Design a protein around this nucleic acid. Structure first.
Lengths: 98, 817
DNA sequence: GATGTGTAGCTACACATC
DNA sequence: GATGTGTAGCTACACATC
């Protein structure tokens, strides 16, 4: 049975390698030339040091902490191999896709 | 002209030509120190500082990567460092300078920092970015500073670490990485874990102090969700530690690290870890392959097989240098014994002919070395460490012996005696029992033979105890029951012929298998079922008569027992299919399906869910199971919020469901039919989850119905079929699904959920080859809701878009023939 | 040998703009 | 959120120079 089952098995492993996470990750996923340092426009200087005003320039406290620590979940390496093998008799394997 | 005006002209001249290129920066530094020195003699010190500042301010509003800004930044950084260099090497040996040099430097840097800080909280991203940038590149060269200026720096930075822009958040750490000697570390440890920008973590990772206290958080990034951030700990951090890994890292973490990199999903991370082992660590230990193995705890590590192979491929030259003279076999250690395993199996797989001839002893001679360690372990009396050391060696040699060339008749018969006397030992640990049977299997060249020999080892071990029980009760002790079944399992794992051919098992079964199934001990019960499951795969009638009892064990059995029982049932169906259910004297499948549900539904035991999940997928793939209601019950357990906590279950379905649909049209069709009702049940779950108010609420523990919908469009899309007959371009599998979704649209209540669907309906695939009548039906349902309901402007647009695509499609059809 | 040099390409990842 | 485009960090080969 192995002949063509082999390739189709090899097809899904390489295609779905990054979708292992499941869940939302199911999606394949996926100028100025010069300055004149002599001119004076110092009123431009006051523009730089302007106060924030209504601009936020900060991160919402929601985004400042995350419980996952942006780590990667434990990987069980669910590949075509782990599927073909039986449960109590790993050596022998069943011929799904037939 | 005025002195003050002359200074400006001089300094402005510098920046004008420094922004053009990096050419004459060396000169400019010398000029600036000159202009400064001229100003301080004329008393106009504060005039030079003023113009310098005002000229730097001109570049702050420039974006990042604006080539001009960088040039000036590097210039300003070089000028401060230049002024400090003159100060350091002067303080070294040259006596203090009469010209108040340190004071001028101290006063200039303090004044400059306070200037650039005036725009630390500017509304502009670029301004804030370039304020930190200047401080980063000049931070090391500041030297001494006033306390108040020190407090103002940590404050402005501790608030910028949580800035809105990542770009500015990066530069915020660089300024902190300097205040690190042991509050600064505290912050970076927090940013390397919670900052949502991979590049901010990376910055906090590479630039962290790497102290004994901070070392765990750094290595933690080995599993960072970012590909780069993982490749770096191998290519950058572990290299920087060189040999300090083996001395200043606890092995349990050490082993975990090497296990991840090798088994990572990205080719770029494996190599980066492989190259660390073969190239860096081998050169760090002067090419001593043994010492390298001494570091990688060979006895306990489970990756030595993976690490060594990558090395053998990375250095095929050292391969020929291995040494195995008869003189050794005296100092054989776990490292050398394992080396023997690693090398021999590698040569066979890759077919290195030259070595196999003389680099390895004959079968007859290897048996002499193997047995030698058996007698030294079991036959005659840091004791436990020694006992383990021998077992490991016995194991390694045994593994190599399993794949030998046994055309040599003397070696085989020699080996055969070694294993038979070993397997006959009662105190042989399970790791050696397993390989022992594996070896004795490779010696028979006759299944019946292999069985006859094995069965003999079992019955002898049985009778030995029974005959010893003859004092003054015709059954072996409990312990003996474990040993016989442990050997019976592996022996049966290798038989591939019915029971009618081998009568000794039917005796063995009535002897110890079935009495174990009825035993009062968990472990023995679990073993009895395992052996029973191995025998069922051979004789079908033995399985049919055992379907009921097996299903019962699952229902009323504890976690462990129910664990092993459910697996057997899956394999029985795998080989025989439906020949063991639904028939005279055969159990009805409806009862078993109910037993699959209760486990799949069961959430108190997660691991058992995984098997029910994995097992059922396999059976649907094999086309033995065909129950829409059951298959529908599967996908629900994927999206359900109750199973989100079972990490293993999610990855199991995430891989089996996509392949199942794309495999065979009938499989995808089964999704299409039952892909609408599932969406409804899930919408209700999300609605009840979001609305319900409970302390234990994880409303984010479920994909929103819009995402879930896109998912069901993905699997039902006929373009994703692998066969692609060419006649599948007209497959109406996806349309019929959407029609079924539209027919359910009337049953959802929340407007938000309704929109979540309508915004994603256009992901479908329409073709003129598809069945005409089916498109007309899809148009009328879309036409039915297009007007008869109230729509959000967004929902109408998408819906209208769909309709006109239909109408534009019917235009492509009828006008034909 | 190792050490640079230049050139080419690659991919996951940012930010830009609407 | 969906885009198009830019960017970071490699990764490889041909090479010199000592």
């Amino acid at each position: 049975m192995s002949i063509f089952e082999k390739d189709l098995m090899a097809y899904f492993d390489e295609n779905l390698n990054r979708n292992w996470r499941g869940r939302e990750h199911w999606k394949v996923r996926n100028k100025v030339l010069e300055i004149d340092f002599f001119k004076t426009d110092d009123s431009f200087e006051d523009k730089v040091f302007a106060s924030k005003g209504r601009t936020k320039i900060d991160m919402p406290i929601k985004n400042r902490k995350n419980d996952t620590h942006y780590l990667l979940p434990d990987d069980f390496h669910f590949s075509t191999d782990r599927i073909t093998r039986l449960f109590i008799k790993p050596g022998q394997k069943m011929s799904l896709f037939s | 002209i005025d002195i003050n005006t002359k200074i400006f002209n001089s300094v402005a001249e510098v920046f004008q030509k420094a922004q053009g290129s990096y050419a004459g920066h060396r000169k400019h530094i010398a000029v600036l120190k000159k202009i400064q020195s001229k100003a301080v003699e004329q008393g106009y010190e504060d005039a030079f500082n003023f113009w310098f500042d005002k000229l730097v301010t001109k570049i702050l509003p420039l974006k990042k990567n604006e080539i001009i800004g960088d040039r000036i930044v590097k210039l300003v950084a070089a000028f401060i460092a230049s002024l400090e260099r003159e100060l350091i090497l002067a303080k070294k040996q040259n006596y203090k300078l009469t010209n108040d040099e340190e004071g001028i430097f101290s006063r200039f840097v303090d004044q400059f920092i306070r200037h650039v800080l005036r725009g630390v909280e500017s509304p502009d991203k670029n301004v804030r970015f370039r304020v930190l940038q200047l401080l980063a590149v000049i931070m090391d060269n500041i030297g001494e500073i006033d306390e108040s200026l020190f407090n103002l720096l940590i404050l402005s930075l501790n608030k910028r670490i949580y800035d809105r822009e990542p770009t500015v958040r990066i530069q915020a750490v660089f300024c902190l990485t300097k205040f690190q000697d042991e509050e600064a570390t505290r912050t970076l440890v927090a940013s390397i874990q919670n900052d949502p920008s991979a590049e901010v973590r990376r910055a906090a990772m590479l630039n962290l102090i790497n102290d004994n206290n901070t070392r765990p958080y750094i290595l933690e990034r080995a599993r960072d969700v970012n590909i780069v951030n993982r490749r770096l700990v191998y290519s950058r951090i572990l290299k920087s530690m060189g040999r300090k890994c083996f001395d200043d890292i606890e092995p349990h973490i050490f082993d975990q690290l090497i296990e991840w990199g090798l088994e990572d999903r990205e080719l770029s991370v494996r190599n980066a870890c492989k190259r660390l082992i073969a190239h860096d660590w081998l050169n760090a230990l002067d090419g001593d392959l043994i010492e390298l193995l001494e570091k990688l705890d060979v006895s306990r590590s489970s990756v030595c097989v993976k690490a060594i192979e990558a090395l053998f491929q990375s250095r095929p030259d050292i391969l020929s240098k291995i040494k195995f003279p008869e003189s050794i076999w005296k100092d054989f250690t776990v490292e050398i014994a394992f080396l023997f395993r690693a090398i021999y199996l590698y040569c066979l797989d890759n077919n290195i002919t030259e070595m196999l001839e003389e680099n390895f002893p004959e079968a007859s001679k290897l048996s002499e070395h193997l047995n030698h360690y058996i007698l030294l372990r079991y036959h005659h009396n840091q004791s436990h460490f020694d006992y383990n050391t021998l077992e490991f060696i016995i194991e390694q040699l045994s593994i190599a012996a399993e794949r030998y060339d046994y055309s040599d008749e003397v070696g085989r018969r020699s080996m055969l005696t070694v294993v038979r006397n070993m397997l006959a030992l009662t105190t042989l640990s399970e790791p050696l029992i397993k390989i022992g049977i594996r070896v004795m299997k490779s010696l028979s060249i006759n299944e019946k033979d292999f069985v006859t020999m094995a069965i003999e080892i079992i019955n002898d071990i049985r009778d030995d105890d029974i005959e010893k029980q003859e004092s003054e009760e015709k059954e072996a002790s409990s312990a003996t029951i474990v040993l016989c079944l442990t050997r019976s399992s592996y022996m049966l794992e290798l038989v591939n012929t019915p029971l009618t051919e081998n009568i000794l098992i039917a005796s063995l079964m009535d002897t110890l298998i079935t009495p174990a199934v009825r035993n009062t001990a968990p472990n023995i019960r679990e073993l009895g079922v395992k052996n029973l499951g191995l025998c069922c795969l051979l004789d079908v009638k033995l399985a049919i008569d055992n379907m009921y009892i097996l299903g019962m064990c699952v229902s009323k059995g504890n976690a462990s027992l129910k664990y092993i029982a459910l697996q057997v049932i899956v394999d029985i169906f795998s080989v025989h299919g439906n020949t063991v259910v639904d028939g005279e004297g055969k159990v009805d499948s409806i009862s078993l399906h109910k037993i699959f549900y209760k486990v799949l539904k069961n959430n108190g035991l997660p691991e058992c869910q995984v098997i029910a999940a994995e097992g059922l997928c396999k059976l649907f793939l094999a086309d033995v199971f065909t129950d829409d209601d059951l298959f529908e019950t599967l996908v629900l357990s994927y999206f359900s919020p109750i199973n989100s906590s079972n990490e293993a279950l999610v990855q199991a379905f995430a891989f089996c469901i996509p392949v199942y649909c794309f495999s065979h049209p009938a499989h995808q069709q089964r999704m299409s039919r039952t892909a609408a009702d599932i969406l409804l049940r899930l919408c209700v779950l999300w609605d009840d989850l979001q609305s319900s108010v409970i302390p234990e609420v994880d409303r984010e523990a479920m994909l929103k119905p819009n995402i879930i919908f896109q998912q069901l469009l993905f699997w039902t899309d006929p373009r994703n079929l692998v066969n692609q007959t060419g006649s599948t371009k007209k497959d109406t599998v996806q349309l019929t699904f959407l029609i079924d979704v539209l027919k359910i649209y009337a049953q959802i209540e929340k407007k938000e959920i309704k929109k979540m669907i309508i915004t994603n309906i256009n992901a479908i695939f329409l073709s003129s080859e598809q069945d005409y009548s089916t498109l007309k039906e899809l148009l009328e349902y879309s036409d039915d809701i297009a007007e008869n309901d109230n729509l959000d402007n967004v929902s109408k647009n998408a819906l209208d878009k769909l309709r006109n695509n239909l109408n534009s499609l019917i235009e492509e059809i009828n006008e034909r023939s």
